[model samples]
Structures are given as C-alpha cells and as structure tokens.
Target: GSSGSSGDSKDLALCSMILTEMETHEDAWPFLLPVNLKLVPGYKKVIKKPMDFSTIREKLSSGQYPNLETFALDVRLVFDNCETFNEDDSDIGRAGHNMRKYFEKKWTDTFK
Candidate 1:
C-alpha cells in the first residue's frame, strides 16, 4: 500500500490479494505485515463518503474515524509488530507470497 503518484492498479491488486490469502491461510499470517493502503487512489474520497467501511462499522460499533484512514493506521501498527518477528532472509519468499495473496484477495473483495 505504498501509494504515491506512481501508484497503479497493480499495487492495489497486490495488497488486496495478499490480505485475503492471509485471512484464509492462517499459517501465512506470520509472514503478513501492515501496509499503507490509504496511499491508493480514491482512498481519500472513500474516507469522505458515507459508504466507507468505517462508517458502516461505526454504525455497529463505537469506532472513531469512519473511514479507511483508521484502517490504514491499524495496518501500520501490525507492520510494526511484524518487524519484531525476527524473520530471516530465507523466509522472505514465503513472506512475500503471503503478501501477494493478501493483495489479490483485497483487490478482488474491494473491486469485484
């Protein structure tokens, strides 16, 4: 979710796919890390709208910041925790695969 002017559909797709994969395969959770999804296009707009995930969840819970920004922040927290897991270079591939799965899943769930 490292968004910027260079961000594109591929990056968004990767984030979504990886997240979904992790949710389904709990083993991959260890390799998963947080990303800045809010960097993606339309994030700000989605955050401002009533149809945002935060708004929907807020109606059911007492959460603040009814938008993806809150989720992004939460994701960042997870990423920080991931850095402490003490993984080695050999595990990078597995970690990357898990991340890819997460991105694909998120993209499909959000866009499809």
Candidate 2:
C-alpha cells in the first residue's frame, strides 16, 4: 500500500452505482494499456480490478490523468465492448457527465 500515507484514507469508490451503469472486468481480460504497468506483462490480478483502476492510479501518481478525455476514452472502450453498452449507448453520455464531475471535484479541491 506504499506508505499508506495518512493522506490516502479517502477512497475513489465507484463502478457499482446501478445495474445499467455498472462496469465490470473479467478475471483475465481487458488489461489496461500503455501507461498501465508494462512491467507486469503477465499479471493476472489486473482483471480482478477495474480496467481503469490501474490507469487512474498511474494518473493519481502521475498527472492524475492527462484530461477528462482520457477518462472518457477508458469508459467508452469498456462500455463499447460490454453487451449492455455500445457506441450508441447513452451510458457514455452519463459517464462523460460523471467523469467531468470527477475532474471538477479533483481540480477544484486540488485533489486534497
């Protein structure tokens, strides 16, 4: 938990809000790309975690993500692949909304 720095008590709780809005990952699939731990090429626990979980962690430890679009892209890819959502699904719309709120919340608070 790396220092567990008394600074990280706040959780980023998400992905289980509603059935239609729920985002899940398999036990060995959808490995996040690029910046997501290229070191763990054979990792398996990743699937046990949300596809974007690592990405967000990388960002929080990095730029907390380049921008809201990065978050949107991650959401779209997962939803698009899911049977419940596709390119035309309005879930993307709502996800965009929520991601924006996240961005505002973090930026305004300086991620305090």
Candidate 3:
C-alpha cells in the first residue's frame, strides 16, 4: 500500500459528495452502469478499461483507490470511453461531453 495523500480525510468524502450529484445529472444515466456488452457488442473489444459511476462508488466506499488522483482517473474514464464508443452527435455521446463538462467545473471548484 502507498502513503495517503496530504488530504486523505477530505478526499473520500468529497468523492462521495461529487458522485451523488453526478448520479442526478441529466446526462448521467448512460454512464451509471457498465455498457451492456450484449447490446453494444464491440464495446469490450474497444474499451479495455471500462468504468462507471457505480464502480467508482463501490471503489470509494471500499477504499480501493490509493489516492484522489486515481479516483479522478476512473471518473474521467467513463466519459472518455463513451466518446470512443459513440459519435459526438449521438445522444449518449453528447451526454458524455456534457457530463464531463459538469464534472470538470465541480472538480475545479472543489479541488483546484
């Protein structure tokens, strides 16, 4: 295991707070869970590192992330993967862009 970051105590709680808000975002539904490979057949082949809100929630709750940096990476992964799988003009793709915009603002205000 690695050493905790300077602000470990606040990091996990902030992650939860941000995640809860993200769940309620209008663009969040498509990213709430794993993409159903049954429906989106090529997703698995293209996106080797799949991530989702539920997965991040579980990871945060279980202390799976060694630090906030990794937590942020996983959060961004969901949107990046969406962009890779869908076209920007598509509903889900737009949602991914919108959601990532929202998260970036929140992230900047909260952490930066």
Candidate 4:
C-alpha cells in the first residue's frame, strides 16, 4: 500500500520468471513438491517448515510475499532443508547446492 509504482505488480514478473527457471532446472524434481511425510516420516519431525517449488509458486501467484526478499527466503529454505536432511556428497545434497548457487547468481545479477 505504498504510493508509488514500486509496490505494484510489475516487480512480481521478475519473481515469476525466476520461479519458472528454477522449476525447469535439471535438479528440480526432488523439490517440485513437498516431501511425502508418509514416505519419509522423519521429514515432518526434522523439518518444522518444509518448502518447495509448488508451494512457492502458489504463494507467488497469490502475492503473499511482501517483497522479493521474502520470496527468496522461501526459495532458500528449500535448499537449506535439503542440506540439513541429506549428506553433502549425496545426489540430493549436490542438487540443493547447485540450486542455491543458481538462485544467488540470479539474485546478484538482478540486485547488484
């Protein structure tokens, strides 16, 4: 509810684009949706707030984030949780690292 174009919907376009790119990343499958609590019972206990691309997409479309940084935090949480739950050398952990780097790069190019 600011009195300028800055708070309008235009900024969301960039977020949408970034979200699409992340969704299509080769390592995105594991993070496309929330972890199955039934399959991985420990996940629910280990991760207090699990996040994923699908959830991010829904929040973005609904304009729930107050700003780009808020959106980014959720994106990072996906990777952070992965690292916390998987070994660094494991496939899932490696993918999480890659995706984290990818997002940082994107964020730098845009905000730097």
Candidate 5:
C-alpha cells in the first residue's frame, strides 16, 4: 500500500486537516518559513471543514454546490463535468469512486 496512502488518504488527510485548521483560525492568523503560505489572502476559507456531508450528496445529486467555499464534493463535481473526456475505471473512474466513498463514509460517520 506504499504506492500511496491507500486510496489517496494521505492527500485527503492533509486537505481535510487544512480545512480543520482554517475553521480554527481565519482572517486572524501564520509564519515566515512559508511552508504553507497559500493559506492566506482569505484562502483559508477557500474550503470549509464539512459539518454535514450528506448535504454534499444532496447538492451534488441536485446539480448544485450552493456554497462559495471549495469542498471535496465540489472537486468531485468538477470531475463529473469531465466525465465526457475520461472513462477507464483505472483512471478518473477510480478517482471518482474513492472521492465518493471517502465523502460517503464521512456522511454516515456524522450521523453515527
């Protein structure tokens, strides 16, 4: 499973956490080393930590995001638009599956 963190968890872990941190700080927070500088200029709110993930499914299924913030669902929706260009399950299809599964899992976790 070393090719990556098994279904992009490594990447999503970082992204999900970035949202968590943004929720914790915003407009008011950083450092000089600039290890994560793109988080500034109001970019902190670029994506929000999801509080109710089923809403993502709702919006996605209904053809809307309805939020100014970026989100995993939003990214997945973007690929939905690109489905015209890709088809192999080994490529975009697989990525989409992972994204949906990841968020779907979160959606249920919030309820439990």
Candidate 6:
C-alpha cells in the first residue's frame, strides 16, 4: 500500500526531472519544448495499480485525452505509477493497451 505509493512518488519525481531537464535544454526541440509548464505539475496525479485495472480502464474509456500532449502525459503517468516489474502479465497488458489508446486518441484528436 504505502510502498506502492512511495514508489509512484519516486517515479513521478524521476519523470518530472527528465521532463524538466528536456525543457530546459531544448533537446527535443520545437516538438517537445514550449509545452505548457502548467501541465508539468499534474503528473503526480496519475496513478496505476498492479492488481487493479480500474484507473487504466477509466482513463481509456473516458476519452478525455485526445492528442500527443495529453497522451504523453498519460504515458508518463502510467510509467510513473506502474512498477518496473510485476508478476501480473494480464494487468500489465491492459495497462499497456490503455497507454497506447491514450496516444492514439491524442494523435487522432490532434491531427483530425
């Protein structure tokens, strides 16, 4: 319980560091830089559970994220929330699907 929460917080911190570094250095250039700094603070809110898939399902089903910015945020969220290694393959697959769906929805919404 608390272990997972702690792990997630650590992951979010790591991701935030990466994003912040990239933003400052402009390594990814125009595609990544210039992103809304406001959104950076929200990464901590993304949560994923090893045994439970409800969050992933709800986010995927909500259709709230319809482009790369949102999708990247979701991916970063999942990456931040999920453990690097776990025994549950099915749940992992579902989470992966949700992340992909987020990206696809984002792409579609942005391009279309």
Q: Against the true structure, what is each candidate's TM-score?
A: 0.34, 0.26, 0.89, 0.88, 0.30, 0.24
Residue 108, candidate 1: C-alpha displacement in angstroms: 8.1
Candidate 5's residue-wise lDDT over 1-112, tens digit each?
Answer: 3432223234443445433432233210111012132643542243233122234334434535333234555544433432433354535444444444554465345322
For 1-112, candidate 2 gives per-residue lDDT tens digits of 4632222213222221211122232211222332244564533343333344345445434544344445445544443332222122454434544444443454435323
Q: Is candidate 5 or candidate 6 better by TM-score?
A: 5
Evaluate residue 80 in candidate 6 and report its C-alpha lDDT on the 0 to 100 scale.
34
lDDT ranking, best first: 3, 4, 1, 6, 5, 2
Relative to the true structure, candidate 6 reaches a TM of: 0.24
Between prediction 2 and prediction 5, the one with superior TM-score is: 5
Q: After superposition, how far is residue 20 of candidate 1 from its true place, in Å?
A: 7.4
Count steric clashes of candidate 6: 2
Model 6, residue 68: what's the lDDT?
A: 33
lDDT of 3 by residue, 1-112 (tens): 5554457657878888888999899999888977887898778899888788988898899999877788888998889988998778998889998899999999888776
- Candidate maximizing TM-score: 3
**Shift in Å, residue 49, candidate 5:** 22
Clashes of each: 20, 1, 0, 0, 0, 2
- Cα lDDT of model 1 by residue, 43-82, tens digit: 3343332122223233324434344444444443333333
lDDT of 1 at 82: 38
- lDDT string for model 6 (9-85, tens) is 34333334333433333212222322233664442243332221234334434554343344356545443344343
Q: Which ten residues in a row have the lowest lDDT in candidate 3?
A: 1-10
lDDT of 2: 0.36
> After superposition, which runs of candidate 1 have C-alpha atoms over 4 Å from their true positions?
1-21, 31-62, 89-97, 104-112
